[PDB]
């Protein structure tokens, strides 16, 4: 349903840009934190931003490292590019919450806990 937003969850943040979502995780979140938001470069799609690596230097240095993942949203269908595609974003995030998705640079997004919407 259009009134029943699938994004009415704690990990979905309304208006956030690429670095804003990053600032969210790098400053307010922690290792394994993820949040999905509406894409500004790709209007109509969503993005999963995650905090990869630890900030104490047991994975990388220079605080933690945030990667954002593109969630293709066509006809209210969500997919990062892996597994089954869901009509709800909750299933999407939880799917990769158990099955970490990997970048070609080695950065693999370990979705563990959602970044609470600070409002």
């Amino acid at each position: 349903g259009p009134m029943a937003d699938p994004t009415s969850e704690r990990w979905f943040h309304g208006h956030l840009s690429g670095k804003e979502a990053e600032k969210l995780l790098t400053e307010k979140g922690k290792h394994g934190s993820f949040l999905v938001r509406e894409s500004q470069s790709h209007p109509g799609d969503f993005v999963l931003s995650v905090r990869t690596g630890d900030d104490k230097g047991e994975s990388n240095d220079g605080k933690s490292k945030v990667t954002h993942v593109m969630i293709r949203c066509q006809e209210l269908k969500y997919d990062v590019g892996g597994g089954e595609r869901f009509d709800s974003l909750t299933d999407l995030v939880e799917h990769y919450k158990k099955n970490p998705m990997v970048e070609t640079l080695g950065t693999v997004l370990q979705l563990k806990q959602p970044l609470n919407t600070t409002r």
Partner: peptide, 11 residues
């Protein structure tokens, strides 16, 4: 990586 929206290469 930095924004970029990740490659996500499932091997």
């Amino acid at each position: 990586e930095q924004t970029e929206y990740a490659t996500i290469v499932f091997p």
